From Swiss-Prot, chain A:
Record-linked SUPFAM superfamilies: TPR-like
TPR repeat residue numbers: 2-31, 34-61, 63-95, 111-141, 177-207, 211-240, 245-275, 279-310, 313-343, 347-379, 382-406, 408-438, 441-472
Gene Ontology biological-process entries: anaphase-promoting complex-dependent catabolic process; cell division; metaphase/anaphase transition of mitotic cell cycle; neuron projection development; protein branched polyubiquitination; protein K11-linked ubiquitination; protein K48-linked ubiquitination; protein ubiquitination
Pathways involved: Protein modification; protein ubiquitination
Entry annotated with the keyword Transmembrane: no
Coiled-coil parts of chain: none
Source species: Homo sapiens (Human)
Official protein name in the record: Cell division cycle protein 27 homolog
InterPro entries per the UniProt record, alphabetical: TPR-like_helical_dom_sf, TPR_rpt
UniProtKB/Swiss-Prot annotation, chain B:
Entry keyword annotation includes Cytoplasm: yes
Location in or out of the cell: Nucleus; Cytoplasm, Cytoskeleton, Spindle
Pathway: Protein modification; protein ubiquitination
Protein name: Cell division cycle protein 27 homolog
Keywords, in A-Z order: Cytoplasm, Cytoskeleton, Nucleus, Phosphoprotein, Repeat, TPR repeat, Ubl conjugation pathway
Function per UniProt: Component of the anaphase promoting complex/cyclosome (APC/C), a cell cycle-regulated E3 ubiquitin ligase that controls progression through mitosis and the G1 phase of the cell cycle. The APC/C complex acts by mediating ubiquitination and subsequent degradation of target proteins: it mainly mediates the formation of 'Lys-11'-linked polyubiquitin chains and, to a lower extent, the formation of 'Lys-48'- and 'Lys-63'-linked polyubiquitin chains. The APC/C complex catalyzes assembly of branched 'Lys-11'-/'Lys-48'-linked branched ubiquitin chains on target proteins.
Disulfide bonds: none
Cellular component per GO, a single term: cytoplasm
Designated gene of the protein: CDC27
A Gene Ontology molecular function term of the record: protein phosphatase binding
Primary location: nucleus
Amino acid sequence: QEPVQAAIWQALNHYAYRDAVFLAERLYAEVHSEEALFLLATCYYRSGKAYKAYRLLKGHSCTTPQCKYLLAKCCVDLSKLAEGEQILSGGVFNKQKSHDDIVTEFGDSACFTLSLLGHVYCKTDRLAKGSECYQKSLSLNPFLWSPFESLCEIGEKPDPDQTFKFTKAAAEGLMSLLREMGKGYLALCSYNCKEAINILSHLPSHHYNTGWVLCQIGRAYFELSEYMQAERIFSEVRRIENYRVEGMEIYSTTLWHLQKDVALSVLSKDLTDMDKNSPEAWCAAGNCFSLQREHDIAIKFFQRAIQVDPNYAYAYTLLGHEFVLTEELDKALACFRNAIRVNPRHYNAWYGLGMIYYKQEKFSLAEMHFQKALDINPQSSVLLCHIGVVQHALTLNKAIVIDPKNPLCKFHRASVLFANEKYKSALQELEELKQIVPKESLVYFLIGKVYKKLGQTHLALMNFSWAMDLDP
Amino acid sequence: EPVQAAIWQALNHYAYRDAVFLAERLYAEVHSEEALFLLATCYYRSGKAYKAYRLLKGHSCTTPQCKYLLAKCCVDLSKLAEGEQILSGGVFNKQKSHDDIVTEFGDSACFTLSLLGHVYCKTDRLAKGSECYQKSLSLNPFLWSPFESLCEIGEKPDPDQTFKFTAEGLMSLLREMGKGYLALCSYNCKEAINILSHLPSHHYNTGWVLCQIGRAYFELSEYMQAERIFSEVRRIENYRVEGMEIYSTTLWHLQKDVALSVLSKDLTDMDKNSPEAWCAAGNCFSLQREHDIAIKFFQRAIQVDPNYAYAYTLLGHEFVLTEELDKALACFRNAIRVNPRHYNAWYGLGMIYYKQEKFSLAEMHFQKALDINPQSSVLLCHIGVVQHATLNKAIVIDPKNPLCKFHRASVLFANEKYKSALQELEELKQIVPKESLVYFLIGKVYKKLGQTHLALMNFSWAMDLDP
């Protein structure tokens, strides 16, 4: 009995699934225990066939925590999210069981199920309930990076120093790394890009050279739009890991702005060759053909990124931009809106909608989009206006009149000019706005840039420290 | 220690993202080979095998634990040469002993050997493979899969001895069940049914056992009894797809498009990645007389598993119906590469070569099918009679070429032409005095006749001759 199910798990840790599953089937058939049942369902699940585990556990119902966790997980895998809640929460039919109840039920598993419950609440439009779950999970288990990483991406600001603290002593040490890292990834998610590099770079060199860190730093340099400083450490994460696709996502697009045909070609090849069930590889393959500026082929790839992961915002976004160039404005809208559906904090899509409203001269709505976007990210304009540059290389008073009422539409019109090689025209429109809004740091920060490129070093430094002082 | 134990917790709840992160940390922190093993174990269980491979290659893996995981990724990546060179092979070491491998991998010895046997079986070295399997089983007789493979690749181990322990309750069960599966594999199905229906009824009523029985009844061509057992196996185990491809073929021989529709709909959208489900839908649309829609599905079955022989043979039959024999020969030809011990294609080709009047070839083929399974004519000849819904020539060949004559009598028996088949089987019976097969087919025809004397006698003759 005992040695039979000892032996099954030996088969599973060696991934001999057919051997394990066979024994499990006979074990459960001899003795109908809840533990043997669990083990069988376990075997079906790790063998890569969740659906089997679902019908098995479901058909003669077990209530044990080990079965309940697993049954909920198979559901989540199969997108039965509403159901998944009910197994764990007791959520919607009867009264919703509390976290204190949940912890009592699952005990040591409480941390994964709250993580699980977290994920579904978030993916079912209840970030409120989902954040509370993630937080509680981290309380129960500080070694879990994923809950913390979800909270940052939502817009929540958890406290690294309070989140990771265990309550020889090896944890203390691991949590220290995790602390400065936590502080840094939040610092990246809220777009304190200079801070995030500063925190991450101060991290010890062994944990600096890891591809995760460098990948985040790559995202950091990229958001600043220091493209060459970015491509340096993305070329780096590749020679050091070479099996990593996760950061190569945004690296593909950096190589896109720099217009490095061979490198993006090489990346797309190397990425598709490794993992064709990765939206990153397909995002890369996609804008490799945008580089070559053929739009039929790129659309198809971006699509594969959507099929292999429809909860992956960025892939939707990158399609929109490409449809802008082909002048398919109606498809583009739906793209950015969908992008807004999966992640409401993905700034690229807001602005992209706002850009095409502005382009069609629907301003007061474009404002709202630009505003909601620039709240997520200031200095959004640089990247998405550079986009239009890359494309166009391969009423104006009406707007200013309209711009009287609303600042950000105007601000784009300036950012749109600086991105083009029309530097002088920008400064006329800029001062007119500087008078319109002496509140916004954005205005003084742009003057800072526009002076630097014009030579006036003393007057650039000047307006930037003002711009900083006005900034909160 | 706390970090390592925290990972394994995250793994056992399938929180892969949480675990790889700790494992990247732990490995960055210490460049330990066990820290390495964890990271690669976390990438592999995350469902990203390439990630572990590329990692393990780019660092020094020299330990059994490490060497196993890497071999597994290789084999997963269709890098069989690599896989071999890692477990058996020293770049510098010579071909390892069986005993060397066991020493190196200790408890993991049975699994590494199992995986080798698979590699040997995937390459053209069956003998080297079945030796690796036997060794695996002797090291660990709780493993069913190596013995499963042994039966299918034509070898005949002895259950009573092979699963003897060198607990008694599992083995004694395994032995009886093993003896049953071997029978099914050696195609003495009436034995296979008998010997595993002697099993205790709560292991009888498991899905796997019923499936083998159901499998057997198709091989006995007991089609109405077959669908009885499957239908039950469906009720018991609606999540089972394994062995339900042939349930579909049961519902195809019997002409139940109604039930084959229920079956295919269910299986398709239960498991799109199972070829059994696409074989199921493939048969379904064959009945509906949509040949194009039928072949569409059979290729998808093949698409989902190119090492799934039965989809190749079903495409074949669907091609012969559309008289596209060049394409049909290829499928069957593909089928045999794919399946060494598979009567279906061998006979399938035979029937094609027989219709091409190339009886010299047809013979050699029918022998190979009939070597694997003696009764293959009855099923394959039935196919033609469902699909449908010189008399001197083959007689002269029937001197030198007996098998071509037997098939001609079988196809006549498969049609309602019972009288004409006895006449022809008598003439052929003179040419071969003694062939168990022939006395069987007499008894087969006597059932339709009435006559207990003729059926009983001949069957009893045929049995005695081939002990």
